[PDB]
Write a protein that binds this ligand. Structure first.
Ligand SMILES: N[C@@H](Cc1c[nH]c2ccccc12)C(=O)O
Ligand SMILES: N[C@@H](Cc1c[nH]c2ccccc12)C(=O)O
Lengths: 332, 331
């Protein structure tokens, strides 16, 4: 089974876009791939975090993934900080990474502009730890957002460079191109994809979001001023209404054309009620499962222990080979 | 309640009598009054390109030299840096509380950046943060550092103070170690004896044959005073003063008592005594060196003991660091 590695930032402010697009897909990949889900708490502290909230958010993202159907008997799920080998590899890789390769990074330049009060070394060295996270597990494939591509490319360059000196120690990872799921746009900026990080909170629906809160957000979803109003799919002219239909289709599994028939002669209000009703049905189901997981702290600690254990065994195979190659005395 | 002193030891098979009579013989003695921690810094070694076979050799050579000199694994903690994962774990967290500008303005980085320009690696930039982690992990009160490493100790202190300010008194704030002879080069006695000198006649290494020793001592530069006199005067009689320093440090005889012993005698007598005393010392060190260095099982057990102790200490601090910043504790 091919190994797929994914880094997961701590939050549990996953949207219906994270779920309908990617997570639902991940759940099904479990059967045919060896999936590895790493909650990246070490990367999280590259920006100042409230400690109590980081701890809560780490557990929230874990329980959310479990609620969505990621199964720790089929996937390896763990917390980055529970596996020392991540940082151990990153130090070795820092030594084989050019300074100029980190300073040329788009992400470093952008986060430096946004957080000029905390331009730390962690922020600069982010990509090497990311490289280490992937290379430790000999991953063949890694899904990354468009913003994280330069990071996956530098990972490949470091691995090839190290392999050119010492032999084929690392698998050169490739971008994972998904089955692809629901196209889910921002509710007030249909031209942009709904995003975890967005400042305007009317753009997103969160997985843990309340039914009356969902209803408000959908109520104020941007729609065109066509007169009369008509519920028809047209991304060019009716991005607002088309998104609502993509959401409805995704959740109900009803073809878009059938939804058009259903809403012939209805107002945008009717379409918005259906979308809120159907999204809140899905979310009620997710949330009930989340609440079971999140409140069973003994279960969560056991899942994390099992997962870190599995992760450490695999990571150690790679790291030992690295440590042998560069010339370290092996611990006995 | 013994105060903790932390020293980073670069892998090397080439220590000299200047190393031994300067710092090392004193570290051996202070094992009684201090909690001494000796970390062989193999992770720092690879910030510059290393021969793997030579790195592995130099790691075990330096450990066996330390043991030979008297560093005792039941009294001190002696270990290989790469054997203790907590060093890299802490250094990541410290990166997140260390400003880019702080590393940018290190003198060592600027010098190397002018020399190597675009060829420099991230390791050389970040070296001081791992060094800070090395020290802070063990709650070290004192650290001996060279002049060229003073800036690295200052930034360690800044980082630790900063972290404490945010999260409470987690780190001890390290200070420079306070309180052997300054052994000079045999053919250029204004220069300190350096293990990495290209003139091998400048140096006596610890693993040197006693006939090679007599050769180098006989050839040591003196002066052309008329009359020649065995008298201590670093300015005017550097070479003779240096032989007197060697002899004094090796025998524990004060310089004034040696001056008396060599009253009316010649430089040749002084050189004979220095050669005889140094070769006696090195014989005894060499024998111990070969006993430990050839005994792989023993070296494995000593490194394992060392790493088990270092990990136990390191974890106390690292657990508090990981809790403070907000991580879920492994269970
Ligand atoms: N940088 C990723 C998170 C991440 C860390 N390590 C990774 C390794 C593989 C994929 C993703 C990651 C993000 O911004 O979300
Ligand atoms: N930088 C030191 C080696 C070292 C690494 N970590 C240390 C901690 C304390 C003292 C020295 C060190 C040297 O060049 O010699």
């Amino acid at each position: 089974k091919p190994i797929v590695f994914s880094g997961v930032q701590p939050s549990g402010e996953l949207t219906i876009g994270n779920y309908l697009g990617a997570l639902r897909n991940w759940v099904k990949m479990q059967e045919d791939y060896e999936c590895i889900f790493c909650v990246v708490d070490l990367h999280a502290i590259t920006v100042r975090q409230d400690p109590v909230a980081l701890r809560k958010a780490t557990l929230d993202v874990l329980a959310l993934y479990l609620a969505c159907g990621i199964d720790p008997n089929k996937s390896t799920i763990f917390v980055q900080s529970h596996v020392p080998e991540h940082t151990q590899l990153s130090w070795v890789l820092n030594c084989y990474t050019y300074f100029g390769e980190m300073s040329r990074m788009t992400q470093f330049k952008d986060k430096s502009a946004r957080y000029a009060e905390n331009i730390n070394v962690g922020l600069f060295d982010y990509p090497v730890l990311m490289a280490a996270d992937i290379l430790l597990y000999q991953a063949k494939s890694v899904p990354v957002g468009d913003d994280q591509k330069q990071h996956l490319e530098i990972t490949r360059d470091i691995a090839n460079r190290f392999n050119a000196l010492y032999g084929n120690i690392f698998t050169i990872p490739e971008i994972f191109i998904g089955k692809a799921g629901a196209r889910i746009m921002s509710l007030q900026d249909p031209e942009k994809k709904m995003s975890k990080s967005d400042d305007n909170r009317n753009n997103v629906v969160t997985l843990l979001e309340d039914p009356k809160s969902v209803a408000k957000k959908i109520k104020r979803a941007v729609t065109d001023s066509d007169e009369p109003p008509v519920v028809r799919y047209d991304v060019q002219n009716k991005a607002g209404v088309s998104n609502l239909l993509d959401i409805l289709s995704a959740v109900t599994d009803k073809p878009i054309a059938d939804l058009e028939k259903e809403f012939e002669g209805k107002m945008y209000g009717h379409l918005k009620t259906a979308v809120a009703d159907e999204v809140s049905t899905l979310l009620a189901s997710l949330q009930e499962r989340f609440h079971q997981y999140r409140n069973d702290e003994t279960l969560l600690d056991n899942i994390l222990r099992q997962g870190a254990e599995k992760a450490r065994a695999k990571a150690q195979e790679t790291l030992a080979k690295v440590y042998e190659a560069v010339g370290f005395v092996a611990a006995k």
